[PDB]
Amino acid sequence: GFNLKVKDLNGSARGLTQAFAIGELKNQLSVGALQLPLQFTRTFSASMTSELLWEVGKGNIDPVMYARLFFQYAQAGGALSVDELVNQFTEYHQSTACNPEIWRKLTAYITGSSNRAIKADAVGKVPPTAILEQLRTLAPSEHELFHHITTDFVCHVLSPLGFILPDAAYVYRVGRTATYPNFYALVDCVRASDLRRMLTALSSVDSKMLQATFKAKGALAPALISQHLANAATTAFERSRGNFDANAVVSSVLTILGRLWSPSTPKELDPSARLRNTNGIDQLRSNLALFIAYQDMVKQRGRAEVIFSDEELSSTIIPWFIEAMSEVSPFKLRPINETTSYIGQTSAIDHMGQPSHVVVYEDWQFAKEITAFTPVKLANNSNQRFLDVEPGISDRMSATLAPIGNTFAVSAFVKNRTAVYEAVSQRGTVNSNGAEMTLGFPSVVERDYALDRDPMVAIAALRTGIVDESLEARASNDLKRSMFNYYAAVMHYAVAHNPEVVVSEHQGVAAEQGSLYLVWNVRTELRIPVGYNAIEGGSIRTPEPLEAIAYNKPIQPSEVLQAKVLDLANHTTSIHIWPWHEASTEFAYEDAYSVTIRNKRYTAEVKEFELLGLGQRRERVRILKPTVAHAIIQMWYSWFVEDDRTLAAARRTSRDDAEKLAIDGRRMQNAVTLLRKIEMIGTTGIGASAVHLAQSRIVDQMAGRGLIDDSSDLHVGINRHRIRIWAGLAVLQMMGLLSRSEAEALTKVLGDSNALGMVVA
Amino acid sequence: LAIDGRRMQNAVTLLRKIEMIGTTGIGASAVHLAQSRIVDQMAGRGLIDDSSDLHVGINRHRIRIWAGLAVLQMMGLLSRSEAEALTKVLGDSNALGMVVA
Amino acid sequence: SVDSKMLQATFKAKGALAPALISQHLANAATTAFERSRGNFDANAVVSSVL
């Protein structure tokens, strides 16, 4: 992770700063005091990591299955934020009804009409999912959704009789998104709750209509209700004129929450005796999480003061109901004391004792497996595909990687970096002014790396306080979400850690007195200068959260540290396809190593390349492959990078050799550790396979010539360690555990210290 | 439109219950036969990394229809006209999937 | 409801569903309930207003 510093986050992790959500302009410490309660449901965001796959057009229907994807599609990064999705679909819904044709056409595709209405239609209802593609002329639908979705009703099950089929199912999927929410996250999510309101009656009409309609007879003739059948939805289309401004509700609600908790009695702030109870947000008010949301939204908006409410009804009303209470999300409104469990602690002590190291870590234990990729392109020649994965790369590589999961028993990495303990004097007297306070058990890494953000850039921005901000709306707001959610995810592990807090002003600019922050008492430690809080008040009593948790004590991990991941094995034969893509894709990418002895530069040329035990290429396949697994690793790499940056700067800064001693130690704790890591990972076994195979091509390189032919002096004090890190490269790339790229980062550490074997072998 | 799906229905129906007649066994032996032979003709041919086969696809279907004459071969009835005349109709008829299976 | 609610929901189990369990919430709900009273009405208020 990243490290700071007791007085600081502020130079190198401003996102940490609440004031930024508060709007403190990067510097001044929460001054005000002058604070009231805070409290808990502990409170809104994601449970955790949920993975699932998706059935579409099954013909049983109902709102719940999609809106999720519709919720998800965003998550899917459908196009842009859900409300698009809802809007873009609703928009079809809007080139609405003047197409009674589809009814007319459904009626007309009621075969070929009721024109000979009679008791007749009997078959063919899987190709009118495929059919309601035929409906594409009336409504355009690259955004398959309705093009897929429009199907559902028409083939509700009605004709429940006559027809007939279908008797089959589709795929949806969804890999985890966020464990925590953000307010524009909220606005969409509400837009999802609205598509949700939308369906039922829509579910109901067809469902309703068909049972009521067919008194019959067996078939109740025809020219029938389906003519209404579809009629209801457009009717439904109009049925949306529009429920609320979800944006309106959400912003009004954020404003109300600020108020719910405000410091300033003045009335941008009149939280009622009349309505403060009244169910509603009253259970919600305690909630910190909304409070985090409030802090950010407000900075973003301040509060959007339209007072949609009156202080009675409404403020009774559009705040009557809320999205989270409405379930198109995979967010859930949080349990109330657990928070998001998953931490052991230790903290610094040269015997004095105090700390500026941390010991909070990853609570991780990732997948035991991974995925082939072949989109079974064949059936319908489009997205309709099946990867059709079979024993191939996937099983051998997995087992072999499956040490791979091993390197990163994440608690163990924190173990190493929490193994530190003594330098900087002892036992007793290490500590020198600056700190380190450090973090994270998988969700933040998981949220990004999957999302191609490569956290790292957002992270540098994070630290430097003010964000990097070149970024694309895709790019910029990847940054945004990751920075918001990351901080919040920590926060209700920060909020959770000590209930005492206090909603703080800031003051700051006016801007509208909204801006507000939180402080708490934690009692225990002797007075080792920890910011300005030691505590001076019995207890930590610092609004800065890192500040708050940090002056506290060790524990253990409640959490699973499960990597989760999705088996579709039932599907894995079942389907058919949802909106899948990123696989990763084609199975691997080539990487070789060349070694010198007797001085003959070679290059065996193994890739990347099967390695695996068959030839070759292979083909075909790849593995959008459990982020975590990439995730856990991303974290180890991050560590390397951080320490190195620090060192360089200080060594130039710190002339003293003793200072240099300290420096080698940090750079080369990275060095050493990375080196040890390399050795191990490479003696993973396959890689060891690379060692025999790549050697041999290098044997050919070792044995190309006659003179070279006496095969190796290539084996030296260095070699075994050399093609050992051939083994390192083999662990290193296209396992897919790591993308590549980084390789030079590891190089950077190896270079930094002779490292050598250092021994072995 | 109506006739055409309905043509549609007729076709779907045929392909599937052709499945049923055609596979159902003893036919299935055909169908495997379609596999054993083709498969080792695949292995026999040499390079199978791109061998699909069977999941799906008419090729999914094509098995079903090869079973389809086959059962309807060793009947004393048909003749072999039926197939290919069948085959032709059924084939474009549609077959449109999905639905096997 | 909490205890009543919690216990039926809590113990998927197993026979006992191990422990360290919900009763940790078990009681949690009441204080939560404690807070749950911030206060419904002024009954005095209601009553006098009503008179």
mmCIF file of N, CA and C in Angstrom, chain A residues 236-315:
data_model
loop_
_atom_site.group_PDB
_atom_site.id
_atom_site.type_symbol
_atom_site.label_atom_id
_atom_site.label_comp_id
_atom_site.label_asym_id
_atom_site.label_seq_id
_atom_site.Cartn_x
_atom_site.Cartn_y
_atom_site.Cartn_z
ATOM 1 N N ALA A 236 -47.571 1.791 -20.186
ATOM 2 C CA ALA A 236 -46.452 1.875 -19.263
ATOM 3 C C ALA A 236 -45.389 2.878 -19.665
ATOM 4 N N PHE A 237 -45.241 3.017 -20.959
ATOM 5 C CA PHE A 237 -44.276 3.944 -21.367
ATOM 6 C C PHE A 237 -44.775 5.230 -20.786
ATOM 7 N N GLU A 238 -45.989 5.576 -21.160
ATOM 8 C CA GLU A 238 -46.519 6.849 -20.654
ATOM 9 C C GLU A 238 -46.579 6.901 -19.126
ATOM 10 N N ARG A 239 -46.721 5.718 -18.566
ATOM 11 C CA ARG A 239 -46.856 5.448 -17.161
ATOM 12 C C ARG A 239 -45.637 6.086 -16.535
ATOM 13 N N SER A 240 -44.508 6.016 -17.237
ATOM 14 C CA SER A 240 -43.454 6.929 -16.872
ATOM 15 C C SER A 240 -43.905 8.175 -17.552
ATOM 16 N N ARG A 241 -44.283 9.177 -16.776
ATOM 17 C CA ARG A 241 -43.975 10.533 -17.140
ATOM 18 C C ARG A 241 -42.760 10.904 -16.305
ATOM 19 N N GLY A 242 -42.760 10.447 -15.048
ATOM 20 C CA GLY A 242 -41.602 10.507 -14.162
ATOM 21 C C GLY A 242 -41.879 10.679 -12.678
ATOM 22 N N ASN A 243 -41.440 9.684 -11.908
ATOM 23 C CA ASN A 243 -41.756 9.506 -10.480
ATOM 24 C C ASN A 243 -41.240 10.594 -9.534
ATOM 25 N N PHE A 244 -39.998 10.980 -9.742
ATOM 26 C CA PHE A 244 -39.297 11.849 -8.841
ATOM 27 C C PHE A 244 -38.174 12.351 -9.684
ATOM 28 N N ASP A 245 -37.464 13.377 -9.231
ATOM 29 C CA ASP A 245 -36.103 13.559 -9.704
ATOM 30 C C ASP A 245 -35.313 12.746 -8.726
ATOM 31 N N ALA A 246 -34.818 11.608 -9.175
ATOM 32 C CA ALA A 246 -33.958 10.795 -8.345
ATOM 33 C C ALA A 246 -32.775 11.681 -8.074
ATOM 34 N N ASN A 247 -32.390 12.429 -9.097
ATOM 35 C CA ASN A 247 -31.293 13.307 -8.775
ATOM 36 C C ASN A 247 -31.831 14.216 -7.709
ATOM 37 N N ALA A 248 -33.073 14.647 -7.917
ATOM 38 C CA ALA A 248 -33.614 15.655 -7.049
ATOM 39 C C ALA A 248 -33.664 15.042 -5.687
ATOM 40 N N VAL A 249 -34.169 13.821 -5.635
ATOM 41 C CA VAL A 249 -34.385 13.222 -4.346
ATOM 42 C C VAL A 249 -33.059 13.076 -3.678
ATOM 43 N N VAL A 250 -32.101 12.578 -4.422
ATOM 44 C CA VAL A 250 -30.836 12.246 -3.834
ATOM 45 C C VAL A 250 -30.169 13.489 -3.288
ATOM 46 N N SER A 251 -30.152 14.573 -4.062
ATOM 47 C CA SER A 251 -29.450 15.775 -3.617
ATOM 48 C C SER A 251 -30.165 16.390 -2.444
ATOM 49 N N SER A 252 -31.489 16.413 -2.539
ATOM 50 C CA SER A 252 -32.317 16.989 -1.495
ATOM 51 C C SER A 252 -32.042 16.219 -0.210
ATOM 52 N N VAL A 253 -31.911 14.906 -0.374
ATOM 53 C CA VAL A 253 -31.626 13.959 0.690
ATOM 54 C C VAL A 253 -30.246 14.135 1.310
ATOM 55 N N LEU A 254 -29.255 14.400 0.483
ATOM 56 C CA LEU A 254 -27.927 14.661 0.968
ATOM 57 C C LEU A 254 -27.960 15.922 1.807
ATOM 58 N N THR A 255 -28.663 16.913 1.291
ATOM 59 C CA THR A 255 -28.799 18.172 1.975
ATOM 60 C C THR A 255 -29.438 17.906 3.298
ATOM 61 N N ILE A 256 -30.508 17.123 3.272
ATOM 62 C CA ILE A 256 -31.223 16.839 4.499
ATOM 63 C C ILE A 256 -30.310 16.128 5.492
ATOM 64 N N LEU A 257 -29.466 15.202 5.010
ATOM 65 C CA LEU A 257 -28.513 14.491 5.887
ATOM 66 C C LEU A 257 -27.499 15.429 6.533
ATOM 67 N N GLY A 258 -26.908 16.277 5.712
ATOM 68 C CA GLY A 258 -26.036 17.262 6.278
ATOM 69 C C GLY A 258 -26.825 17.785 7.451
ATOM 70 N N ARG A 259 -28.046 18.225 7.172
ATOM 71 C CA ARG A 259 -28.803 18.917 8.185
ATOM 72 C C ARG A 259 -28.961 17.964 9.336
ATOM 73 N N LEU A 260 -29.267 16.716 8.994
ATOM 74 C CA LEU A 260 -29.553 15.682 9.963
ATOM 75 C C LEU A 260 -28.474 15.689 10.979
ATOM 76 N N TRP A 261 -27.306 16.079 10.532
ATOM 77 C CA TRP A 261 -26.194 15.999 11.397
ATOM 78 C C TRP A 261 -25.527 17.315 11.674
ATOM 79 N N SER A 262 -25.985 18.343 10.975
ATOM 80 C CA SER A 262 -25.297 19.631 10.991
ATOM 81 C C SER A 262 -24.846 20.086 12.380
ATOM 82 N N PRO A 263 -23.792 20.894 12.384
ATOM 83 C CA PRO A 263 -23.385 21.712 13.509
ATOM 84 C C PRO A 263 -24.250 22.942 13.610
ATOM 85 N N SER A 264 -24.463 23.630 12.500
ATOM 86 C CA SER A 264 -25.136 24.925 12.543
ATOM 87 C C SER A 264 -26.650 24.869 12.688
ATOM 88 N N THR A 265 -27.145 25.364 13.813
ATOM 89 C CA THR A 265 -28.568 25.319 14.123
ATOM 90 C C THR A 265 -29.269 26.087 13.050
ATOM 91 N N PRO A 266 -28.535 27.174 12.566
ATOM 92 C CA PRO A 266 -29.214 27.890 11.483
ATOM 93 C C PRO A 266 -29.466 26.947 10.326
ATOM 94 N N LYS A 267 -30.568 27.255 9.672
ATOM 95 C CA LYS A 267 -31.628 26.413 9.192
ATOM 96 C C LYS A 267 -31.634 25.740 7.835
ATOM 97 N N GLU A 268 -30.609 26.441 7.062
ATOM 98 C CA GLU A 268 -30.130 25.446 5.994
ATOM 99 C C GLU A 268 -30.028 23.996 6.707
ATOM 100 N N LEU A 269 -30.957 24.242 7.835
ATOM 101 C CA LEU A 269 -30.759 23.427 9.021
ATOM 102 C C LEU A 269 -31.853 23.319 10.086
ATOM 103 N N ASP A 270 -33.069 22.968 9.700
ATOM 104 C CA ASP A 270 -34.178 22.988 10.649
ATOM 105 C C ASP A 270 -34.699 21.609 11.068
ATOM 106 N N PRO A 271 -33.835 20.525 10.768
ATOM 107 C CA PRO A 271 -34.240 19.176 11.220
ATOM 108 C C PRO A 271 -35.272 18.986 12.321
ATOM 109 N N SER A 272 -36.445 18.664 11.803
ATOM 110 C CA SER A 272 -37.749 18.727 12.477
ATOM 111 C C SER A 272 -38.006 17.791 13.646
ATOM 112 N N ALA A 273 -38.757 18.389 14.562
ATOM 113 C CA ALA A 273 -39.423 17.622 15.603
ATOM 114 C C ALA A 273 -40.617 16.920 14.960
ATOM 115 N N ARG A 274 -41.209 17.587 13.974
ATOM 116 C CA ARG A 274 -42.365 17.056 13.262
ATOM 117 C C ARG A 274 -42.055 15.773 12.499
ATOM 118 N N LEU A 275 -40.906 15.756 11.832
ATOM 119 C CA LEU A 275 -40.578 14.667 10.918
ATOM 120 C C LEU A 275 -39.282 13.897 11.126
ATOM 121 N N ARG A 276 -38.489 14.273 12.120
ATOM 122 C CA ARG A 276 -37.196 13.618 12.284
ATOM 123 C C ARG A 276 -37.370 12.131 12.571
ATOM 124 N N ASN A 277 -38.380 11.803 13.370
ATOM 125 C CA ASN A 277 -38.801 10.422 13.505
ATOM 126 C C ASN A 277 -39.396 10.005 12.159
ATOM 127 N N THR A 278 -40.673 9.644 12.130
ATOM 128 C CA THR A 278 -41.366 9.408 10.863
ATOM 129 C C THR A 278 -40.677 8.369 9.969
ATOM 130 N N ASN A 279 -40.165 7.295 10.560
ATOM 131 C CA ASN A 279 -39.480 6.272 9.773
ATOM 132 C C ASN A 279 -38.437 6.940 8.879
ATOM 133 N N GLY A 280 -38.564 6.762 7.566
ATOM 134 C CA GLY A 280 -37.707 7.461 6.630
ATOM 135 C C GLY A 280 -36.222 7.273 6.875
ATOM 136 N N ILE A 281 -35.510 8.393 6.945
ATOM 137 C CA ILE A 281 -34.056 8.400 7.066
ATOM 138 C C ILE A 281 -33.571 8.383 8.515
ATOM 139 N N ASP A 282 -34.527 8.342 9.442
ATOM 140 C CA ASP A 282 -34.247 8.354 10.878
ATOM 141 C C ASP A 282 -33.298 7.229 11.280
ATOM 142 N N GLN A 283 -33.471 6.070 10.659
ATOM 143 C CA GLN A 283 -32.567 4.944 10.883
ATOM 144 C C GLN A 283 -31.301 5.230 10.092
ATOM 145 N N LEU A 284 -31.519 5.863 8.960
ATOM 146 C CA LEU A 284 -30.470 6.332 8.086
ATOM 147 C C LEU A 284 -29.598 7.470 8.646
ATOM 148 N N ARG A 285 -30.156 8.306 9.516
ATOM 149 C CA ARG A 285 -29.423 9.481 9.977
ATOM 150 C C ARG A 285 -28.188 9.099 10.777
ATOM 151 N N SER A 286 -28.315 8.055 11.583
ATOM 152 C CA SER A 286 -27.219 7.642 12.462
ATOM 153 C C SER A 286 -26.056 7.351 11.536
ATOM 154 N N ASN A 287 -26.393 6.757 10.383
ATOM 155 C CA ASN A 287 -25.513 6.117 9.470
ATOM 156 C C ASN A 287 -24.400 7.076 9.237
ATOM 157 N N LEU A 288 -23.174 6.643 9.415
ATOM 158 C CA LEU A 288 -22.095 7.458 8.954
ATOM 159 C C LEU A 288 -22.051 7.500 7.420
ATOM 160 N N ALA A 289 -22.294 6.364 6.766
ATOM 161 C CA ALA A 289 -21.873 6.200 5.394
ATOM 162 C C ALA A 289 -22.487 7.279 4.553
ATOM 163 N N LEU A 290 -23.753 7.544 4.816
ATOM 164 C CA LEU A 290 -24.450 8.630 4.149
ATOM 165 C C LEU A 290 -23.711 9.916 4.494
ATOM 166 N N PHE A 291 -23.232 9.989 5.728
ATOM 167 C CA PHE A 291 -22.449 11.127 6.118
ATOM 168 C C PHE A 291 -21.192 11.322 5.270
ATOM 169 N N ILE A 292 -20.499 10.247 4.909
ATOM 170 C CA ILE A 292 -19.321 10.335 4.043
ATOM 171 C C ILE A 292 -19.798 10.888 2.734
ATOM 172 N N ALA A 293 -20.891 10.285 2.277
ATOM 173 C CA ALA A 293 -21.514 10.675 1.026
ATOM 174 C C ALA A 293 -21.823 12.151 1.101
ATOM 175 N N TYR A 294 -22.454 12.538 2.186
ATOM 176 C CA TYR A 294 -22.843 13.906 2.331
ATOM 177 C C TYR A 294 -21.595 14.834 2.175
ATOM 178 N N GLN A 295 -20.522 14.509 2.891
ATOM 179 C CA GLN A 295 -19.306 15.311 2.870
ATOM 180 C C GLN A 295 -18.806 15.518 1.446
ATOM 181 N N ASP A 296 -18.787 14.444 0.662
ATOM 182 C CA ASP A 296 -18.330 14.542 -0.734
ATOM 183 C C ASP A 296 -19.388 15.235 -1.607
ATOM 184 N N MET A 297 -20.610 14.828 -1.508
ATOM 185 C CA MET A 297 -21.509 15.397 -2.428
ATOM 186 C C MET A 297 -21.397 16.949 -2.260
ATOM 187 N N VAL A 298 -21.333 17.355 -0.995
ATOM 188 C CA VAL A 298 -21.575 18.738 -0.659
ATOM 189 C C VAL A 298 -20.464 19.490 -1.242
ATOM 190 N N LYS A 299 -19.290 18.899 -1.139
ATOM 191 C CA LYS A 299 -18.159 19.623 -1.683
ATOM 192 C C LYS A 299 -18.434 19.746 -3.163
ATOM 193 N N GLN A 300 -18.929 18.654 -3.744
ATOM 194 C CA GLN A 300 -19.204 18.608 -5.173
ATOM 195 C C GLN A 300 -20.299 19.578 -5.519
ATOM 196 N N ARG A 301 -21.291 19.621 -4.638
ATOM 197 C CA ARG A 301 -22.467 20.428 -4.854
ATOM 198 C C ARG A 301 -22.723 21.423 -3.733
ATOM 199 N N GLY A 302 -22.352 21.127 -2.483
ATOM 200 C CA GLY A 302 -22.757 22.057 -1.446
ATOM 201 C C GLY A 302 -24.077 21.609 -0.849
ATOM 202 N N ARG A 303 -25.031 21.235 -1.699
ATOM 203 C CA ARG A 303 -26.329 20.820 -1.184
ATOM 204 C C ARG A 303 -27.538 21.047 -2.101
ATOM 205 N N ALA A 304 -27.395 21.828 -3.165
ATOM 206 C CA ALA A 304 -28.491 21.938 -4.124
ATOM 207 C C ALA A 304 -29.804 22.292 -3.445
ATOM 208 N N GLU A 305 -29.825 23.485 -2.866
ATOM 209 C CA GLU A 305 -30.887 23.942 -1.986
ATOM 210 C C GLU A 305 -32.162 24.367 -2.669
ATOM 211 N N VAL A 306 -32.963 23.383 -3.050
ATOM 212 C CA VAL A 306 -34.339 23.644 -3.483
ATOM 213 C C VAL A 306 -35.390 23.272 -2.417
ATOM 214 N N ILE A 307 -34.932 22.665 -1.339
ATOM 215 C CA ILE A 307 -35.848 22.371 -0.275
ATOM 216 C C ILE A 307 -37.049 21.773 -0.959
ATOM 217 N N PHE A 308 -36.827 20.679 -1.663
ATOM 218 C CA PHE A 308 -37.927 20.029 -2.327
ATOM 219 C C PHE A 308 -39.028 19.881 -1.283
ATOM 220 N N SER A 309 -38.630 19.565 -0.064
ATOM 221 C CA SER A 309 -39.562 19.429 1.041
ATOM 222 C C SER A 309 -40.045 20.789 1.505
ATOM 223 N N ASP A 310 -41.223 20.798 2.122
ATOM 224 C CA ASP A 310 -41.570 21.601 3.283
ATOM 225 C C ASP A 310 -40.990 20.840 4.455
ATOM 226 N N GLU A 311 -40.906 21.450 5.634
ATOM 227 C CA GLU A 311 -40.363 20.706 6.780
ATOM 228 C C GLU A 311 -41.287 19.604 7.332
ATOM 229 N N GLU A 312 -42.559 19.601 6.937
ATOM 230 C CA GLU A 312 -43.429 18.443 7.208
ATOM 231 C C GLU A 312 -43.554 17.507 5.959
ATOM 232 N N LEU A 313 -44.720 17.494 5.306
ATOM 233 C CA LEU A 313 -44.961 16.641 4.141
ATOM 234 C C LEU A 313 -45.038 17.405 2.816
ATOM 235 N N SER A 314 -44.009 17.320 1.986
ATOM 236 C CA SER A 314 -42.734 16.752 2.356
ATOM 237 C C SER A 314 -41.855 17.937 2.667
ATOM 238 N N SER A 315 -41.102 17.875 3.750
ATOM 239 C CA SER A 315 -39.990 17.010 3.979
ATOM 240 C C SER A 315 -40.415 15.670 4.472
#
